[PDB]
Symmetry: C5
Subunit: 213 residues, 5 copies
Amino acid sequence: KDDDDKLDRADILYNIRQTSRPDVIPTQRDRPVAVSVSLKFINILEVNEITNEVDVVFWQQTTWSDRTLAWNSSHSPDQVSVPISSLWVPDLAAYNAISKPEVLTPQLARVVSDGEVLYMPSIRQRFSCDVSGVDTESGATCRIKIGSWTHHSREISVDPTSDDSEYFSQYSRFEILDVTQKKNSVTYSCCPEAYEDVEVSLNFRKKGRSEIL
Amino acid sequence: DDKLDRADILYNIRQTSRPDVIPTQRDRPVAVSVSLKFINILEVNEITNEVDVVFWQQTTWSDRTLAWNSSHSPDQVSVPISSLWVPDLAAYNAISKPEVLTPQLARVVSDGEVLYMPSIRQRFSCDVSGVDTESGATCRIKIGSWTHHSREISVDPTTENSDDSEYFSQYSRFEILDVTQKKNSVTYSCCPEAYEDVEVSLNFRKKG
Amino acid sequence: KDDDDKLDRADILYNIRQTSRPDVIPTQRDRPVAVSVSLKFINILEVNEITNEVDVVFWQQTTWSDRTLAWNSSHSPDQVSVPISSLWVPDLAAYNAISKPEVLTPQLARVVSDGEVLYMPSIRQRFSCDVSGVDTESGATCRIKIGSWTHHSREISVDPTTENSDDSEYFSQYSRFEILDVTQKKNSVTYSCCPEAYEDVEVSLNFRKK
Amino acid sequence: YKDDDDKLDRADILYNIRQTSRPDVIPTQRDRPVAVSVSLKFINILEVNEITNEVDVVFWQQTTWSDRTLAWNSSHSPDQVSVPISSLWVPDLAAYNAISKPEVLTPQLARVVSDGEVLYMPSIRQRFSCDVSGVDTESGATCRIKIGSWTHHSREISVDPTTENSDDSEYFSQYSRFEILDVTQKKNSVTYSCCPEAYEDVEVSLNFRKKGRSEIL
Amino acid sequence: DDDDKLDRADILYNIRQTSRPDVIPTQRDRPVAVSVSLKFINILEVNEITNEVDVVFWQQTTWSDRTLAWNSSHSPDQVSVPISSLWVPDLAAYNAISKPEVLTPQLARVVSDGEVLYMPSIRQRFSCDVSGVDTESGATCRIKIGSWTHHSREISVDPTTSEYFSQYSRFEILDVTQKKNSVTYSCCPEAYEDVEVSLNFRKKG
Ligand SMILES: C(=C1/CCCN=C1c1cccnc1)/c1cc[nH]c1
Ligand SMILES: C(=C1/CCCN=C1c1cccnc1)/c1cc[nH]c1
Ligand SMILES: C(=C1/CCCN=C1c1cccnc1)/c1cc[nH]c1
Ligand SMILES: C(=C1/CCCN=C1c1cccnc1)/c1cc[nH]c1
Ligand SMILES: C(=C1/CCCN=C1c1cccnc1)/c1cc[nH]c1
């Protein structure tokens, strides 16, 4: 009932900008920042079986908490939209991306009165992954690994939260069999740091395939 | 055309404008009217079900806090959109960034109405089958606020049906049979919020 | 003889930045701002007769006046270069452009002591226009329509030049195409919905494949 | 390590770095050149054009140097923080044979270590003019990439390799059309007969080949 | 003294206090003398159908601004400076058909005597006669570089009075000339001083 009180929203934005530290990780209770990531695939635009590359569009549902941003919403809006330039956002990258992430949507996040932040850009991006079997019944399984680029596991944990039937375009030349998203840890022989990431396994295949029976 | 009046109006708008806060008046959602006027259909890819199009995105809404008495001053001024709140519209089936081809200025009217109408080039995933037939193809584009649900913003059409004869290029390979624009509400199973959108059905065919 | 007086130039630039209102149309008295636009074609890069599209490069000579910027040049520079971010510039758009105007050149304008402003970017841009006849002796005639995007005729008037040429001084000798004629006609656009009229110049590019 | 998640500590370190940092001045200590270490970890080879002698590749550019004025005592505070590169001096590296801008695929953050070490490792997609002859043979092609400071000569910046040899097995995509045989990185000093200054660069030699070189037809 | 950091910071501070990035550094009420020399690095994406060519070149650009000079008897002789802190000539390739792609860090060198050197590596496309590219006589590209907005009374742009070209280009250079040229248009009285660069090349073989 108080959502549409403009002055209240303006004051909330003011409060957020006073407290927000866009360049500092919001670690609370001496624990790493728990970042949840879930990709909702919207389309598969191009796949190349020779080069093992895919071109896809997905909604990157990204959530985390910063309780320093919280406010009492007993008589004020429960949520507001905030430009991400005013907020800290996780420095996520896909390890096997071969193009820049192209953000297709307005760069606004939602901040909830309990301090939860939700940012969900629609991203088009190209990846190097296993496209073998895309023209078969069992299809291909393209794996995409996403994690913090510069923050190791003691600082940020990136965690997962389907056939994406609610999201995936019915007009794609491909169809999604299954999308699994699992916790994964990465370490390199040179160095002690581990990186937490989510491994997204996209199992898909070409629609209306012609087979030899 | 009184320059000092215009400068003062712009000053006033910038003193009052809150570019990041939705202009909810009373305790109601912001009513955003959107109407796409198609100008060109550049490419139609039957292999991939994709279209590349150019359209004017006629967008209007009110912010009465911007209003002024224009009895003896200009009725409207042009304002850079960076000085204004503008709705965070996005097309759900866009597969490229909206490319704005025109100067990023809005008109503000002395009654507080704002008109923003970018020319946009953008690619979409949609049903392209039938494009070379009498019935044509019907490509549906859903547009709405990306982050504001129905209690905060309503996105509504103006003209429900039009052949865009005043807008669409006579030199295109294609012709417009009908552009239908209707209110549409989207909810996802995961969450309670609804998003109020305009569903734009672009029915077009290859000229022959 | 005072053009290269550096302190003079710095002071002129200072004065312009004190006076200039980059977001307000420089209307003088009770009249629209008169804007002249002349396209000088450098090249025609690609033409598609099936889709009726062209890819061109041109110098967009744009002139207007803001008398509030004028100064007494009797013992100072006649002109200076000014970043366009410091100036009001006409919000011109090509109504049949199908790509963003790509500016190839430094974004500087000239301001003359009498208040004339000249901005002439080199632009690469694609258009939807009539390419029919490009392979004939008479060639194709592609019309490019340019006017203010948000200012109607009471606020900005776009006045065509009286020039008639094949742009021999500008156009690449090595283009696959040849320009037969480039002309401009004043035109006014109105839509049935609304009373406002928008002034434009229609630039007619008559060209053919060599 | 126990203090890594102390948020106020991190904010204060960032403030300190921003008070001390001179983003446009080389961090010369004593009167010695800034020692810049560079190591390219190749991830993908996207395109190899045998007609034109061009390659399009993705690599992680591991770049390290020291600015001891940024150091702090981390006995009871975070050992490292992430910092936007706009707040830091970064070496003005360029590849002499690049034919496209470096496209940075990742967030533009560096790590600053409490001893003053800085680590910046962007993933970069870039195109190069190099020798691709032999890519379809057993011995492969060897594409050499020369990287150095664009405007600082050897008295001001030295650009040196880290690891001499590797097949990048931990980094290179197993799904590429190509496979890496060896990546060698050597110091190289370049002077032009016109002028006296020398530029101290790294020559990166990427020896790679197409998989499945024996085809039917 | 070159690697004295505080000295370098102070020089940068001094340059920024005196630099007027938007005002031409005309001295003695004479035009700014800008010297330009292109070093060709590569010839790429040559299209014989469309008569277009990509070139990569280092654009060696020098001029002086004596107000930037300092006494370097006990301090650095030279420093690197972001070009945003300096006036730089507004050079353009008048005839180019693509945006210049600057491939290198946008830093200039400032010498203690006030000399400035800026040398971007640039990739850019041009309209050229490519018809003879596979013949002994070859193809020709003409590139005209000058100030975009400053005429000859304000800026003079003159040519400076195998080490660089890629050994892996498909093409080889037959000749390069870089000549003083003054460009005037029938419509208007101003002349623009430019360097006319003629690049003659052919496919190897
Ligand atoms: C660096 C990694 C691995 C995980 C991805 N990000 C980073 C990173 C770390 C720090 C700064 N920038 C990027 C690395 C892996 C081996 N040696 C260095
Ligand atoms: C999010 C949606 C759906 C409507 C489009 N915008 C949003 C959105 C909402 C909030 C922030 N950014 C985008 C969503 C989440 C689960 N399911 C859909
Ligand atoms: C708007 C037009 C037509 C001329 C082009 N610019 C505008 C415009 C006007 C105002 C703001 N932004 C663009 C329009 C509206 C209905 N019919 C045409
Ligand atoms: C310039 C060189 C050497 C190659 C690398 N960088 C530079 C450089 C030097 C200074 C500023 N910007 C670039 C040069 C000049 C004549 N010959 C070579
Ligand atoms: C203008 C030229 C020719 C040389 C290139 N720059 C300019 C210029 C001059 C002023 C501002 N912006 C560009 C010109 C040529 C014929 N009529 C006008």
